[PDB]
Design a binder for these strands. Structure first.
Ligand code: MG
Ligand code: MG
Ligand code: MG
Ligand code: MG
Ligand code: MG
Ligand code: MG
Lengths: 147, 52, 52, 52, 129, 134, 187, 122
RNA sequence: GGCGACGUCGGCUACCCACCCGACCCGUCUUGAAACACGGACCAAGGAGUCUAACACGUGCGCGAGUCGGGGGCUCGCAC
RNA sequence: AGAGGGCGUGAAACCGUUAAGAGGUAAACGGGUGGGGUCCGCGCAGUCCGCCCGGAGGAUUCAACCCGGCGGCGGGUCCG
């Protein structure tokens, strides 16, 4: 849509929206990120603080699969299975707690996030946080580990 | 020649427009006000039998 | 192939047909309903032109 | 929902004994702004690149 | 006046003089079509006295008298019979014109349909034999 | 509608194959219809025109029931000359005005050994078109 | 001249939606009848909310609504939201409340209709309560977007908490000088 | 759905003339040729239209049947009226307002009928 | 209420002419141009904010804790 | 041939010619009227058009009322 844009409405005026005085030339401030310490310094602090310098340890050839663990916290914990389970879970049949393994749902670690409901569970994950296991051990549930 | 010639539309909008394109071909006002002279024809979703 | 609003489409895996933003769409009937016109003020139908 | 019955017409023009129920496609939301948005964008996938 | 069109008022017009471009007298490369002068020093934009006026919204004509012909109608140009019949309930308010492409055979017919419907045509005797 | 993706439908390439045509294609494209008496006796529609066909002109300035033989077939200018339709010059010499063979109707073929074999093949290939209707 | 100062002449609100939705345009025509004619202020709130943009119409989740209708007094009112009702995974069971909204989502209106509640459009709200009597009109967190946590003083001012635009989070991306007292300073 | 069919056809349709001025609607079944919401002969459950008679003697009055839409071969029921220039102008106004069939556009049915009868007078 | 026929009545534009008043030549950089600042003898056609990538924000539409086939794959051998 | 051998259409700058008008403050222009001119519209002391009523003679047949007759409007047991 070249129809709806600014240069049709700006055609007939001499300086084309760039000034009689400044008169937009080519590169008045330098090309790219030029002047990042020197004359554009006020811009690089106050909008990009931290941008210049070493901060850490160098780690040659990291592989983004060894540090891979997705997390499911306890609020989202019941949507991994059917809603047909937990309504079937509490119907006076004993303490028969259903399994929820997050590893066949594609998650490795179970974190904490409050309001885990009143039913007992067994939760199969590779990792846990200690807030998360004491929510599960508070509703009478169990917390079974897998490699 | 590397101008972006081609456009994507996500498919629930393709199916949204194709339900709105069929439902207006049953209203006799919209199909006659596009010009199709459909005065003498019978019932507007015309269905002839499968022998055709 | 597009499914009704009770059942989804069978030949399309995860598509059901789009819901409406208006159910009753003839608003000449809505504004003449006794529920609406029990509540209105009155029309104000003078003109009150400029006075010399 | 109001889904009337539609007569199937024979090859000689007159009606038959078959009457198909209107499927729920024909009661979809009519949106000529999406149909404009789709037909604008999908007629542009149709074209050779310019004689640059 | 072949036909009389309801109430025709005194058509006042604010100007009858057809705004010309600045320096259009001095050159022939410069058409007389209005272009507003955007120079930084010129005396038309800065609006000195005794010089070329430049149009603004104050010169607009009265709304009840806008697009009125001197005969009191408002033109609506047509091409054939089938769009002459759309002006049937407007015949004391609007008048028809025949477009300049309509051949002398067909122009003869859509003025005889105009006389039956009593609609004013502004150019009835055009492209005769 | 054309379906074969190896034959043109553009304007500019069909003209260029028309005016640069080889002279054996050019006798094919200069064909004329047979008369209604004669297309029933031979059950063939039209024929490429040759030198001594009796012929009459069906449209133009010179037309109407004037059987008269061709005398010269310009292929290069896509023009037959017929012995009767002529034109006086300003000099007073009479010249043949030339007309295109699509605007022209054969009323008597000139049969030789080849014009038997062309008609028989153009006629035999129509009964197979009748035999397809089963 | 008069000296009555400029910029007081023009107001910069919306008098019609910028949508070309022919079903929102009839909801507009229904309510700008009811706004200028029934003398109730519910119909002025709902009318200027139909004009609002998509950012000014944030989605309202299923457990902001039913948490804002466990309050005392709200036991039999109807929930109006001009905008979508999505559903929370966090909530386990749903009360039987009566809602009224543009464009309730598919999984949300399966959970409202299993609970025994009734979903309404703005047509059959207008037939139901034309004055808007007995309605609890709700809104979503319109400053809940990812965009508003980028706005503020500056990311490199004292106590900014403004979250700068980095192209990728990680070490060595805007973390060296100005962010720790060892390297340079800390703002 | 008189209004949503209107909001498709409002602009952006055939039967729509816009030249230099006013807009016209050139419908088959429309009294006053405006593209009004009232004066549209496709979009309503009830419509009135008066075309000239075929021979040039009288007025036909098409009205919409209401017994079934969506079936336009039998949607229109028309009556040729050939009477003496005020009892045909009185007959079509009993057809409007003795019925409750659109008391709206009652004069526009008789402004049109009177100005289409003096289209026939010589 | 009154006045007027075959040369008269009315009308206006890119018509021409007269007169009174007002009026220096445009574009441009510039505190300031009619400038003793620069460019322009004249006409015709051509002639300058584009396209791709990235990002930001506003707005419009679809779905909505999800969303997205763009990469492939399938559908008789089909002009479009 | 107002297509006559670089010949479709044939613009402007420029130049010849004829017609009209004018001319010591270089020309050109803005505003305001005037004079002439080209031309148009009306048609020329001859301009109103349709509405209803009472006048004057003429010419026909319905209306009102009923019956035949098909077709539509609206309400009803929701009777099928
Ligand atoms: Mg400017
Ligand atoms: Mg600018
Ligand atoms: Mg600058
Ligand atoms: Mg200045
Ligand atoms: Mg090609
Ligand atoms: Mg200057």
């Amino acid at each position: 849509p070249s129809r709806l844009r600014k240069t049709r409405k700006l055609r007939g005026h001499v300086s084309h929206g760039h000034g009689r005085i400044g008169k937009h030339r080519k590169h008045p401030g330098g090309r790219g990120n030029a002047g990042g310490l020197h004359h554009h310094r006020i811009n690089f602090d106050k909008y990009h603080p931290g941008y210049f310098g070493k901060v850490g340890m160098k780690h040659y050839h990291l592989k983004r699969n060894q540090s891979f663990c997705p997390t499911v916290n306890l609020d989202k914990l019941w949507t991994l299975v059917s809603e047909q389970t937990r309504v079937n879970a509490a119907k006076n049949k004993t303490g028969a707690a259903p399994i929820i393994d997050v590893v066949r749902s594609g998650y490795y670690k179970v974190l904490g996030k409050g309001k885990l409901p009143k039913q007992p569970v067994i939760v199969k994950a590779k990792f846990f946080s200690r807030r998360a296991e004491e929510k599960i051990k508070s509703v009478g549930g169990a917390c079974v580990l897998v490699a | 020649t590397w101008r972006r010639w081609h456009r994507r539309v996500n498919t629930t909008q393709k199916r949204y427009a194709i339900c709105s394109a069929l439902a207006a071909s049953a209203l006799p006002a919209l199909v006659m006000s596009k010009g199709h002279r459909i005065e003498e024809v019978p019932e507007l979703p015309l269905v002839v039998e499968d022998k055709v | 192939l597009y499914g009704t609003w009770r059942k989804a489409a069978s030949l399309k895996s995860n598509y059901n047909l789009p819901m409406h933003k208006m159910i009753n769409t003839d608003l000449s009937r809505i504004l003449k309903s006794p529920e609406i016109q029990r509540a209105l003020r009155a029309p104000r139908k003078k003109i009150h032109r400029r006075v010399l | 929902c109001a889904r009337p019955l539609i007569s199937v017409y024979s090859e000689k023009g007159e009606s038959s004994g078959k009457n198909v129920t209107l499927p729920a496609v024909f009661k979809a939301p009519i949106r000529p702004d999406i149909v404009n948005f789709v037909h604008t964008n999908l007629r542009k996938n149709n074209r050779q690149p310019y004689a640059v | 006046a072949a036909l009389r069109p309801l109430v025709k008022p005194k058509i006042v017009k604010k100007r009858t003089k057809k705004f010309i471009r600045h320096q259009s007298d001095r050159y022939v490369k410069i058409k007389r079509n209005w272009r507003k002068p955007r120079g930084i020093d010129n005396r038309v934009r800065r609006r000195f006295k005794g010089q070329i006026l430049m149009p603004n919204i104050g010169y607009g004509s009265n709304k009840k008298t806008k697009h009125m012909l001197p005969s009191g109608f408002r033109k609506f140009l047509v091409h054939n019979v089938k769009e002459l019949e759309v002006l049937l309930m407007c015949n004391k308010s609007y008048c028809a014109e025949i477009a300049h492409n309509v051949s002398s055979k067909n122009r003869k017919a859509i003025v005889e349909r105009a006389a039956q419907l009593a609609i004013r045509v502004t150019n009835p005797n055009a492209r005769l034999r | 509608m054309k379906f074969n993706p190896f034959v043109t439908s553009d304007r500019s390439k069909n003209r260029k194959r028309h005016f640069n045509a080889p002279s054996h294609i050019r006798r094919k494209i200069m064909s004329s219809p047979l008369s209604k008496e004669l297309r029933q006796k031979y059950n063939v529609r039209s024929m490429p025109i040759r030198k001594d066909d009796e012929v009459q002109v069906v449209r133009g300035h010179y037309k109407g029931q004037q059987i008269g033989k061709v005398v010269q077939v310009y292929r290069k200018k896509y023009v037959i000359y017929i012995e009767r339709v002529q034109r006086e010059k300003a000099n007073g010499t009479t010249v043949h005005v030339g007309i295109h063979p699509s605007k022209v109707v054969i009323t008597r073929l000139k049969l030789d050994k080849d014009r038997k074999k062309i008609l028989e093949r153009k006629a035999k290939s129509r009964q197979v078109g009748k035999e397809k209707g089963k | 001249g008069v000296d009555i100062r400029h910029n007081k002449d023009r107001k910069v609100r919306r008098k019609e939606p910028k949508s070309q939705d022919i079903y929102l345009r009839l909801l507009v025509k229904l309510y700008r009848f009811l706004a200028r004619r029934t003398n109730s202020t519910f119909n002025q709130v709902v009318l200027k909310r139909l004009f609002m943009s998509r950012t000014n119409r944030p989605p309202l989740s299923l457990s902001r609504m039913i948490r804002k209708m466990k309050l005392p007094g709200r036991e039999n009112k109807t929930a109006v939201v001009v905008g979508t009702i999505t559903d929370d995974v966090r909530v386990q069971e749903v009360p039987k409340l009566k809602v009224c909204a543009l464009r309730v989502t598919s999984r949300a209106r399966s959970r409202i209709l299993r609970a025994g509640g009734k979903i309404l459009t703005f047509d059959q709200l207008a037939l139901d309560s034309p004055k808007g009597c007995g309605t609890v009109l709700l809104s979503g967190p319109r400053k809940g977007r990812e965009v508003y946590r980028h706005f503020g003083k500056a990311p490199g001012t004292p106590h900014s908490h403004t979250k700068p635009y980095v192209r990728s989070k990680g070490r060595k991306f805007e973390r060296a000088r100005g962010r720790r007292a060892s390297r340079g300073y800390k703002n | 759905s008189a209004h949503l069919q209107w909001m498709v056809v409002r602009n952006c349709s055939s039967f729509l003339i816009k030249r230099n001025k006013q807009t016209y609607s050139t419908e088959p079944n429309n009294l006053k040729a405006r593209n009004s919401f009232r004066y549209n002969g496709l979009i309503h459950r009830k419509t009135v239209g008066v075309e000239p008679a075929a021979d040039g003697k009288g007025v036909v009055v098409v009205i919409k049947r209401r017994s079934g839409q969506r079936k336009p071969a039998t949607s229109y029921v028309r009556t040729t009226i050939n009477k003496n220039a005020r009892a045909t102008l009185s007959s079509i106004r009993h057809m409007i307002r003795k019925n409750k069939y659109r008391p709206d556009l009652r004069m526009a049915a008789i402004r049109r009928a009177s100005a289409i009868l003096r289209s026939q007078k010589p």
